[PDB]
Design an enzyme around this catalytic site. Structure first.
Site, short mmCIF file in Angstrom:
data_model
loop_
_atom_site.label_atom_id
_atom_site.label_comp_id
_atom_site.label_asym_id
_atom_site.label_seq_id
_atom_site.Cartn_x
_atom_site.Cartn_y
_atom_site.Cartn_z
N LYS A 33 87.76 13.30 35.34
CA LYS A 33 88.96 13.03 34.53
C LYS A 33 89.10 14.04 33.40
O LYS A 33 88.27 14.96 33.28
CB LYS A 33 89.08 11.55 34.12
CG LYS A 33 88.15 11.06 33.02
CD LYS A 33 88.47 9.61 32.67
CE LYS A 33 87.48 9.07 31.67
NZ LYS A 33 87.52 7.58 31.62
N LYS A 91 92.15 7.54 41.58
CA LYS A 91 92.61 6.59 40.55
C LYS A 91 93.98 6.93 40.02
O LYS A 91 94.27 8.07 39.63
CB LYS A 91 91.63 6.45 39.37
CG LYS A 91 90.19 6.16 39.78
CD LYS A 91 89.18 6.70 38.82
CE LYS A 91 89.29 6.07 37.46
NZ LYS A 91 88.15 6.45 36.59
#
Lengths: 241, 242, 236, 236, 241, 242
Positions: A33, A91
């Site tokens: 991320k 995600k």
């Protein structure tokens, strides 16, 4: 009722060295991320790729596509980009989506885009425990969104990184109901949001499948002094047993 | 510059496979896969880009938009990879949520790297809005410098709000001519769109525009939402661009 | 079988709903929004004119997140003659704010009379006004100790309950409310054609205004007894 | 002579204000804003504990422009034991909206008991929250048939009534209210040093919370009887 | 009580020819404004100057400085610009000012700037009858603002030009109280806001000092077909007698 | 361009007569009358501009701001007349509420006409904000073209938000050098400000800046609000600009 099952440990590193420390400590899922772009900010195709290259084939490489606006086309293309770059577990931060219908519409398209590349790749519908602070879709309907869009995981995280945790926004009872609901749909449940080591037994008790950590795996915890240490990951991994 | 005759590349924007077949049959040079439901430069789906590439002859180019983008370099880089892998030779980024030169260059540099890492021959388009002030988007007049500094191939303008107001309602012929000259001096190509009608073609040709983008003018009823791409209207446009 | 709720704005409109066979007489004020509150004197005047075998419902508003004010307003509606007290969950943004407000309204109402009904109403089109997610209304009603979980539309632009919620999701909402021991009420520009669908899904109460008004127009038209007679027959 | 109004948040705080010699016991809830409404049960509990010779005041909130809801809330406060009913003119934007809301509150309250007092409260710092101009509050109170024209501060950041209004303008506000046959109440982080100034200008009622709290802190401190005794002496 | 005193006629033209028609019909005050910049939008120094040049020395030339933000320095400089350009009567639209104090502060500075050039020049504090629609200062406190800032005229006009008039936003009673209040402070009162000929007796009855017209003096009334006609001005002037 | 030595004109911004006297005594070339209470380029009062002109030696220039302006050409033209009549030789317009090239050119053309109609020798400055994106102001990079097309004399940059962040926190040396070169190619002078410190002077000199604007660096305590213009600090700055 109470639970005492194994929880999978997901660790979020920002570079290749951090990921090598996460791997050595025993993390199950290496999450790529970019906190600079938000809670579930997207990193770059080359960073996902570098992390996949370094990560053993038996571990999953996870990647966020962002704290997404309601743009199904853009997010479906971004999920293809993350999947092609080496992510097995994708995600989606349900940030700009305002209701059930917008969230299901976006997620159905991401699921199609990802499953068309590889049916074994995992799609995660992520909601925000503190959604009211950012105007995001209600976190409590995330298990139904994941169920109706054909996702594999229903997840919660925090949108604003001000030190307030998952437990500051959701009660143990409501989090237990979220886990049970996701399970009754045949989904897995992942929980994050400045999770500290003290929170792990609470998460195990309610039967969470996956726990996500960044700060608790960092030696300082804070963005300045915090670097992922393998010993911290080992400690977390033991509490997940 | 003022050109007496100037060949322009015709870009037509279909929304599905049947519209793409109509644009091909009419003689469109670039087949642009977009989704007006998600905005001016709304992104279509990976499967639609692939289906349109499959149906488009190899001698023609397939263009695809990644959206009216926010300032999210990571997300947009990933989306650009998705568009390129799906079959696009020409990747268009709508500079919508980017507020200044620095944010636009930072985002575009990352998109250029993501696309060129897949195929160095693939084209990256930095698109600004002629009516940016209406949506708070980056100033259209700095788009040639953004494209130059980010390593893009095309500097482009389009309209953000589709209320019938055209490129010419927001930008003067003089400023558009300076935009084209500036893009050319940086070694870039120039693409112009924004409810372009057949009457605008001689003006765009005069100013030295390389690519002209249309949807509404190529749509049967004239309406870009209500109507559908008709091969005859594409054919009339193709003749004016010659 | 489904209970017919008709929403009048004055005494003559209430008389028209009563004469047509409406089961619940709902006192609201469209000028203050979808579930806008009418005045204490109007609730009293309508109760006075309504036969004792019928129920009087009253809205407290499209409420902001102000538990104290809304608890006081709920007391005002109950004291004025309301049997059913309806709260429009408008300014409340999440589960916790909605439960906190509703718990206080329930306590305020039950402290006056334990037999009085508390209705937690969400908006099928909540995203248009930034109101709490309609799909969590059965859990809000359950956790706050309400008696009815309800949906209505916030913006009265002609778009119906069915333009914002699918039959499937509405059926799941009804089942969820029932599993918590709650009753379910549904409204949102409901037309006579929607009645068999609402009946099929197991809705307990159906709420109408527009369908009961002459020119179909809720904002220019008035409640007609013949229209209320037709909806009542369709409800059987 | 000036009447001392002290604002407690619970029964023990009300007992402290009573013991110190407060003339009016004001039931508010700072959690819901400057004039946030407390609950019906709290107004009743405080009335029960207050000697019959003293008055019980209660706020209905920092109100939006919702006449129906606020009229119902005013009934709720009156029924719960409030003698003085205070309305914070927050969401009302002009003279007309404020008069329309207040006229309805006055009717709702006087219909219960003609002897009950209606207070139109404006904000000295209205510009900070976009509330109705404080300087037109005496005309609003006059035209809506209220009994008291009042000012308070909307944002509790330590800035006082005197940081937003000059002594001269406050004196003109008092004179204007008096010329309409109204009483005047003034509040807004009033300190003991402000009491001679408020007395000079002819203020009828002075409202305090912070000055009556131990650590001066209204949000962390609690009402102390000794502090209420000192303010009462200064009011004489 | 009722009144039957003479009212001064103020006519608002956009160019020199319009002003010549206003002069010929008998207007008392030639008002230089620019509707393109708002209700009380400011025109240019050259337009004020051209209109002064053409206007007999016994008539007043009026000029707006704008629908002003709370910027005392800018507005004081703009009032100097309007006064130097030939305006004898300067109007300030109290638009961005939010309260009594901001309005008095701005107006005190405009009064100083104008009176320093010529003590005989008139300063008008203008409020909006429909202020709530634009978030402007409460119109009802305009007589006190004018009184405390040392202005000569308390005025009302409408901010939004949608066909709604002064009478759609203020009752005859409240307008009568506004006039009486301004008079009790020794101020003159000017009223505007899509004023039609039918409104003039109501305005005379309440004792208004000055009436402002644009639309009622135009042959069409509307921005497209409307041009100031001397006969229309003559008709208005007769109703003001 | 990169200049080994470059003389820069020093502009100091006082708020009253005593501060102006301090800036004069320290050797400031331009005495800039502004009002920080009304914003970055907040306008001071006509009487203050006159009082400062009266106290300033005839060989020095008096500058005055008309504000962080909205898009109101009429109001700003009138304000520019007010500043010019009050004694300003140099009139500065903060392009704050203007959203694009067209609005900025339209406003500036009218200010130029208003000022030149009083005195053709008076200077008109088009000032943009280096951090425009933070306030929604017109893109700073198009300010040389705005000044060129409106007939201004100076293209300027300053910061809108005074939070300690400088001109150099928003614009790179490279982009600032291109801004200076672009202004010069249009026959304009270039003025730069935005919490400029003494350490920034060699950099601004290198890029070819004509005028440097200061307040904070010339203030006793260093703070531009808390502190006051000190002649010694102006003197140290004047030496660095030589």
């Amino acid at each position: 009722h109470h639970h005492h099952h194994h929880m999978i440990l997901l660790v979020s590193p920002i570079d290749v060295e951090e990921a090598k420390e996460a791997i050595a400590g025993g993390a199950d899922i290496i999450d790529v991320k970019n906190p600079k772009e938000g809670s579930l900010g997207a990193n770059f195709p080359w960073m996902i790729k570098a992390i996949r290259e370094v990560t053993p084939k038996d571990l999953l490489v996870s990647a966020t596509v962002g704290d997404v606006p309601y743009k199904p086309g853009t997010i479906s293309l971004a999920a293809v980009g993350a999947a092609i770059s080496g992510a097995d577990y994708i995600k989606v931060g349900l940030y700009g989506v305002k209701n059930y219908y917008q969230a299901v519409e976006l997620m159905k398209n991401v699921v199609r885009a990802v499953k068309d590349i590889d049916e074994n790749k995992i799609v995660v519908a992520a909601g925000y425990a503190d959604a009211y602070r950012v105007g995001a879709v209600e976190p409590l309907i995330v298990p139904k969104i994941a169920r109706d869009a054909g996702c594999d995981v229903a997840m919660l995280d925090t949108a604003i990184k001000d030190g307030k945790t998952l437990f500051d926004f959701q009660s143990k009872e409501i989090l237990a109901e979220f886990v049970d609901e996701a399970h009754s749909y045949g989904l897995k449940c992942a929980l994050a949001g400045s999770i500290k080591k003290e929170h792990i037994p609470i998460l195990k008790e309610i039967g969470t499948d996956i726990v996500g950590v960044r700060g608790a795996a960092c030696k300082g915890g804070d963005r300045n002094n915090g670097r992922i240490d393998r010993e911290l990951v080992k400690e977390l991994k033991e509490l997940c047993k």
